[model samples]
Target chain A: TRLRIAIQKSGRLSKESIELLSECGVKMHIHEQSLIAFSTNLPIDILRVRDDDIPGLIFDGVVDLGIIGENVLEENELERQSLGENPSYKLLKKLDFGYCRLSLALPQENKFQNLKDFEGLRIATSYPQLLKRFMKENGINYKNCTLTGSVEVAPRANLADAICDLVSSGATLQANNLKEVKVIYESRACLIQKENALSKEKQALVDKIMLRVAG
Target chain B: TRLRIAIQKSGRLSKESIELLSECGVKMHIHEQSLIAFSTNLPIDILRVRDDDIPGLIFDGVVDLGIIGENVLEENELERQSLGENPSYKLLKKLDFGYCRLSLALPQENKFNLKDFEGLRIATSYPQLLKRFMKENGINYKNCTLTGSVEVAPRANLADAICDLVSSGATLQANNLKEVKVIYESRACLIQKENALSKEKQALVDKIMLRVAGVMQARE
Candidate 1:
């Protein structure tokens, strides 16, 4: 009977997602450690959770909408597809905020004379599927040393030869002596929904919400 | 070449790990935001990373030793094996700190026997270990994986129950969850790389192991 949405609980996208809802007239008071908040003005529930969980939540029909990055959505989608789970979704909108590029970076000391320099090298990354796909498309054979966080520190810590991670302002990269080279994927805080349709009533409400959200 | 050891960068195991190393006389000054720290007293480097990374670092032979909880160690091993990666490590010693159990917790109002969690969506930071335990017990469940805020999962309508680390009953309060089943017992342990190290590095590891054993003996 109520509409449900999932947003990043904490991190780069958290505040912006909440603000988006607030500005769009979803009245809710989010507080300390509140995992789910119900709108005061409308019958909508907002589930605050880890960004990685949002894609799965929407794909499983656990939530009607998700405010997340395209990097996360495509990465999780590819991961699920590899795992033999047929997950599908519709990108409702490409948001204006939380923008970043998924980039491959190398330490300043590592030379990049040839773009083919990636062959036989280890690359650390948060988005393994995206990296693997990009490398395969480019005919680069690389090994992935996947880390959920701290991809920037990989080369310095001797974890990997290079790294692929989100590059916003590149301040972290500058600090780590990493130079962003290849922009594999660029994204923003996107709105996505399950491929499955909602009930007629819920659909009407969703339709109304979208008109105002984008209006 | 310096022997590299990894420890939790933050969270429940962070400070205790540094204190343990300091007690063992590994003189190192760690400040905020230093991913890798060097020891002045020994030819060693301390890598501060997330808990899951510690086990992977040790198994991948990137770090010679890691001070990690057994729960993380076992959980990551299971995850790796499922991905067809052969990961191995040696438990150097079980330390006195970081004692907690991976317990299945339910909201206080839920009725319980041993079989209460069957078919319920249970949230956990450690889905691999939880799933393994449930599978062995022949209890079926849907897992909701959360890296943090697992205690809020049940109330948030994300899950019906939670499987998380619980040390004191006090830790179970605000979440309105009670420890119903303890699936795994854990403590901070020193784990070493399975691969052979250089003689000097091996000697250094042995020296630290002796010091760690001495400190634990005094406490025991």
Candidate 2:
């Protein structure tokens, strides 16, 4: 059986995602626009997809492995759990690149002293499940307006009172006249495996890749 | 108060959306990278966003008008209605471009049997739209939601079939999938919030609509 690995199609993690595979001796030609790439030297295939799709593919065992961010993994886990599905995966390694933090941001002029300031307000985000969990655990009552892209512009558009999104250099936040008020999740790209056991052949291949990753 | 309109950020409809406004005599400088653009000649602001966000913006009254696909608008309406929110909008006009259809497709080699999908999985981006169509037809199938790369799901063994937007048959044919059933026919539409606009904005919208009617008549 061939080994299938899912990675981000394009984003902060994509370049490093391809590099990591090359370093592990997996050879393949990747096109920026292609969704799947087949390896020539090994029985491997890569499914390039959105980062949010990675965790579900692994959890559903649709692919043998994936490389994705922790924020997405946890958010998917929470969402799946809420939907009454047992989503499971194993972290094989935490890769170095694709570092970012999911944070709660507010307009720069707003005086935000505590989480309570968000009470009965709308918070826009791409990671609604993660944001919902954070709010529930803190006992904060707020509505979530979900936006897959351009969460930062929600406040200014009057779609939401505040926003929760990923922050790397904080430039996007500042450019939108928003400031990071709380860090909800710190994430980096990580290699992950499906919870199910792989066949001996695939396991051997994975072990080889792991050895290279260690080196 | 300035009038606001929402349009697709970038897609098959975005260019036509901007062009429609220009035809209506609205002069504005649009930077592709910017989400919001203010009209220099008129008291109108444009919010360019993902097509999926446009319906919600209009339904929530965040913007006074929008140019979007009927498929997106109706799908969002169904979804929000399921959530108990009244998603209401008025179609001002059907534009001349952004034509497409939502369809269910199967692998080219698969036998053309709709019943085969009764208990199988169909990947799609517009789950709300697909679910409504299937439910009305009394078809039962599991939906695998994928925001992108939906056409590849069947070939990847992640899905048995797919429900997706099809503008041209080229992409589907290249992916080894054939359209089996058309769920909805769609075109770009100009829409306004159901809530009555302010007197000034209402008049502006009426004037723009008259200009659109004139342009469409001239084109015909």
Candidate 3:
């Protein structure tokens, strides 16, 4: 069976994930419109999917391997755990790209001195599980409003009082008049594998790829 | 207070939405980089956001009005209702553009059996809508939620079938898939917040509604 590897279809992580694999001598011509690509030099197939879907694909064992953001992986883990599912995956390598941070932000003019200020306020986020875990641990109470996109505009739209979202260059938040108040998590692109052991052949290839990646 | 109207940032409905407002004499220069745009000729602010966010924005009274597809509005309403929240909105007008149907499609060679979907993965962006339809039909399936590119799920082996928005049937045909069932039919609609608008915003909305009716009548 060909080893199926999932990676981000687009966003900050897609380019670097492809670059890492290509640098490890994986041969595949990626087409803009194609969702799946075959590696010419290896027994591998690449499934280009949404960045948010990568963690679930790995956790559910739909793919043998995945390259995804640590923030997404942790968020999915927390979400599944809350849903009573055992979400497990082995982090194989932390690639030196796709670095970002999950952060809480508010309109710059708002006076926020501590987490207690979030009481009874709506906080918009795409990473609800991550934010919930952090706030719960810190004993802060806030209403969670989930928005899949345009989270930065939530405050100005009056949908939420603040936002918890991924900040890469801090430009998207800044452009939307948001000030990052707290960093909940820092993330980088990581190579991850299913918790179960791979077949001998797949294991050999994984080891080979790991060696090349480490170099 | 400026009347804030939320519309899809970019999608099948974005262009028609902007055009509808423009034809109603609400002139605004839409900046691709900005989420909020000020109407040059009217006391209005356009909030361009994701289509899925429109229903919530209107439902939450975050925006005084919105232009969104009925599918999205109904789907969000159902989801919020199931969560025990009061999700309500007033349908101001049904526009003539942004027509589409949400349908379940599978590979042409595979004959479909509703029961066969049991224990299989069905991909969609509208999971709540899909779940509601499936549950009502007694067909159980796993939902693989994808924000975009849902049509490619089945071909990529990530899903057994797909529930996706179909316009003109071209995308499904191009993917070598056949539509098995249409779950919902949708068109663009103007909707108002559930709560009563401020007197000033209500008057502005009423005026815009009148112009919208005129524009639709002229097309007919």
Candidate 4:
């Protein structure tokens, strides 16, 4: 593998990853496919994976670099670390795109004014580790109600009184009668590297790749 | 306020809910701009929310009634009840349409012989439901929950197999998952809150119910 960089298969991260590489002059086009992207101008390869799988791919030395959302990557790293797994990785660069905030949102009908109001209430979320960390720091013992993508709809469905989820425009939360109560984490696009010594040829390629990323 | 019923905004339940209501003689005229539906010939409203939201609306008295899938309705009730939330509602009628099942499945190449899922992780949208069903039957399996794309979980290496809501099984076949065991069978049910109905509204509800029953019988 010639410095494989992992990016999301689709959605916002996919577009931003391609744009980031293009700006760095990496000369690659991301297809709708999730893995195995061809670089038209370099000896490098791009492997597209699920946004959640990118961190593991990099940490396991399957890829040299990855362009991923910090929220997903950091959360995955934290989970791995807690499980006594190797969680530390190098950050190559932070790109300026795919912005989102992980926050706790309450239903419109609830009389929630702050974190204290959520005491003992089961809060739903997609990011369980992120939610658990925030609650631990706050000295709250809330139950976890995990649901991917539809975290905003949890309260409306009576699945939970509140939710901890990633918010972009907050339009989805508002539409579902859920209001963002607390912002736990803010994230954007980042280029990350796995923990491994690169070969002389690969290091040169990495430096070459950074020139386009930096420019 | 008229009698309110909630149905899926889209999917198998969406079209079937509307068609069933129309057959039942409720004369529901749905407008695209909203989830609340109005019945032309009766004093009724239909609040169309996601299937997961249906049970709560009835329990909270936010909507008078709902047409929702049994798979979602029962799972939600189990979750709420397990949490010590007193959840109750009336099962007005089990409609003939909206047929589906929640089942466990696996990739074709995984050498699954139905009993191979003893300790493997199965991707699913309904972990709580799967967990409960597996527990009652003395079967144990880990879960990797994916909300929309549960079928592809195995191929992504997220799970060894999947437990999902199967409508036509075409999606499962496309993803190379073979249906192993069905946990529950479901149909769309007409559900209502356990509340008192006024004389006029009660009469109106009866009339609409007859039309819906007639429509369903005709469909069969």
Ranking by DockQ: 1, 3, 2, 4
Cα lDDT of model 2 by residue, B1-220, tens digit: 6888988888878888888888889999966576788787899988888898888778867678999998989988887776556788899999877789999999999898567679778888887798888889888987676779898788777789999898843358787888899899998899998889889899999999999999888777
Query: Which residue ranges in model 1 land beyond 4 Å of their true spot?
Result: A81-84, A195-201, B168-171
Write model 4 residue lDDT over A103-208, tens digit each, in one string.
Answer: 9888777777668888977776768778888889989887666554556755655546778978899888888887888899999989888788888898898888
Q: Candidate 4 has which clashing residue pairs, if any?
A: A24-A212, A24-A213, B6-B66, B23-B215, B24-B211, B24-B212
Ranking by lDDT: 2, 1, 3, 4
lDDT of 2 at B96: 79
Model 1 lDDT tens row, A108-188: 987797659889888888787899899999999987676777889888878789999899998999998999888999888
Of the two candidates 1 and 3, the one with more favorable TM-score, higher being better, is 1
TM-score, chain B, model 2, is: 0.96
Question: Residue pairs in steric clash, candidate 3?
Answer: none
Instruction: At residue A203, give the lDDT of candidate 1.
Output: 81
Tens digits of per-residue lDDT, candidate 1, B1-220, equal 6898889888889998989989999989776575788888888888888787788778767678999999999988887676567899999898898889999999989878768888898888898899889999999987677777889878877789999988633478776889898999999999998989999999988999899889989887
Highest DockQ against the true fold, candidate: 1
State each model's TM-score restricted to chain B.
0.96, 0.96, 0.94, 0.92
Model 3: per-residue Cα lDDT over A155-189, one tens digit each: 88666899998998888887888899999999988
DockQ per candidate, 2 decimals: 0.43, 0.27, 0.31, 0.08
Worst 10 residues of 2 chain A by lDDT: A76-85
Docking class of 3: acceptable
The superposed Cα distance between candidate 4 and the true structure at residue A163, in angstroms, equals 14
